[PDB]
C-alpha cells in the first residue's frame, strides 16, 4: 500500500511506527513538519493530534493503534493471542509512564523539578518492575522480539537523555536495548534517521 507518516522532526510518538516499517521492510514517506506547518495541518485532522498515517488516502491516528495495525499477522505482534495481550499490556504500561512527563511545560524550573521527581521516584520503581518481568529471558514476551521490545528501547532512549544513569543498576534492561538496537533493520534505521534530541 501507499503509506504516508506525518509527525514533527522528532523521534517522539512517531518512532515506534518508524521501527515497525523498518523491521518489516515496508516503504513509506516519512514526512516531518516544522511548527509553522502545524496549525495548517492540525485543522484538517479529525482529532488534531499527531502522528497520523495516511494509507491510500485514508487517515489513521493514535501511534499505538497504528503500530498495532502494522504488526498485525506478523511475528512482531506476539505469537499467540495471550502474548499479543502481554505485548499490548507492556506497551501501555510504558506509554502510561511516558505520559507522566510534562513535555510541554513552558516553565523551565517546573519542568526540571517534575522530571527530577519522576526520574528519582517513579522511574526506578517502573525499572524494577520491568527488570523482574523480563527476568533472565531473551525478550519481554515469548521467545522472539515483539514491538514491546521496540517500545522499551524507544522509551528508555528518551528517558536516558535526562537521567543517563537510569539503567546503571539494570544490566538486563541495557542488554535488552542492545539486542533491539542490533537487529539489522533497526541498526540501519538508527544510523539513517535524523538526529534530534527527542
Q: Which stretch binds ligand GSH (CB under 6 A): 27-35, 57-65, 77-85, 132-140?
A: 57-65
Q: Which residue has cell 524550573?
A: 109
The C-alpha atoms of residue 172 and residue 12 are separated, in whole angstroms, by 24
2 versus 107: smaller Cβ distance to ligand D28: 107
Instruction: Give the SS3 label for residue 69.
Output: helix
Answer yes or no: 133 catalytic. no
- Establish if 167 lies at the interface with ligand GSH (CB under 6 A): no
We find the least distance from the C-beta atom of residue 151 to Mg ion, in angstroms, to be 12
Q: Which three cell numbers stand for residue 114?
A: 517534575
- Measured CA distances, 143 to 75, 80, 83 (Å): 10, 11, 10
Q: Which residue is closest to ligand D28 by CB?
A: 98
Q: Are 2 and 55 in contact (CB under 8 A)?
A: yes
Catalytic residue, chosen from 3, 11, 13, 193, is 13
Over the Cα atoms of the chain, what is R_g?
A: 17
Grid cell at residue 17: 511506527
Residue 50 interacting entry, from ligand D28, ligand GSH, a second copy, none, C-beta within 5 to 8 Å by type: ligand GSH
The binder of a second copy chosen from 62, 79, 158, 175 (CB under 8 A): 62
**Residues placed in the known binding site for glutathione:** 7, 13, 38, 48-50, 62-63
Chain positions contacting ligand GSH, by CB under 6 A: 12-13, 42, 48-51, 62-64, 92, 96
Amino acid at each position: 500500500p501507499n503509506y504516508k507518516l506525518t509527525y514533527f522532526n522528532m523521534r517522539g510518538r512517531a518512532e515506534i511506527i518508524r521501527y515497525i516499517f523498518a523491521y518489516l521492510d515496508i516503504q513509506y514517506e516519512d514526512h516531518r513538519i516544522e511548527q509553522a506547518d502545524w496549525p495548517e495541518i492540525k485543522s484538517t485532522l479529525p482529532f488534531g493530534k499527531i502522528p497520523i498515517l495516511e494509507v491510500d488516502g485514508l487517515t489513521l491516528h493514535q501511534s499505538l493503534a497504528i503500530a498495532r495495525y502494522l504488526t498485525k499477522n506478523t511475528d512482531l505482534a506476539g505469537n499467540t493471542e495471550m502474548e499479543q495481550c502481554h505485548v499490548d499490556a507492556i506497551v501501555d504500561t510504558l506509554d502510561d509512564f511516558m505520559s507522566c512527563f510534562p513535555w510541554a511545560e513552558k516553565k523551565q524550573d517546573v519542568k526540571e523539578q517534575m522530571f527530577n521527581e519522576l526520574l528519582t521516584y517513579n522511574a526506578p520503581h517502573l525499572m524494577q518492575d520491568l527488570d523482574t518481568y523480563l527476568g533472565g529471558r531473551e525478550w519481554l514476551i515469548g521467545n522472539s522480539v515483539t514491538w514491546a521490545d521496540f517500545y522499551w528501547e524507544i522509551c528508555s532512549t528518551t528517558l536516558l537523555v535526562f537521567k543517563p544513569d537510569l539503567l546503571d543498576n539494570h544490566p538486563r534492561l541495557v542488554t535488552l536495548r542492545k539486542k533491539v538496537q542490533a537487529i539489522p533493520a533497526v541498526a540501519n534505521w538508527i544510523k539513517r534517521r535524523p538526529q534530534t534530541k527527542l
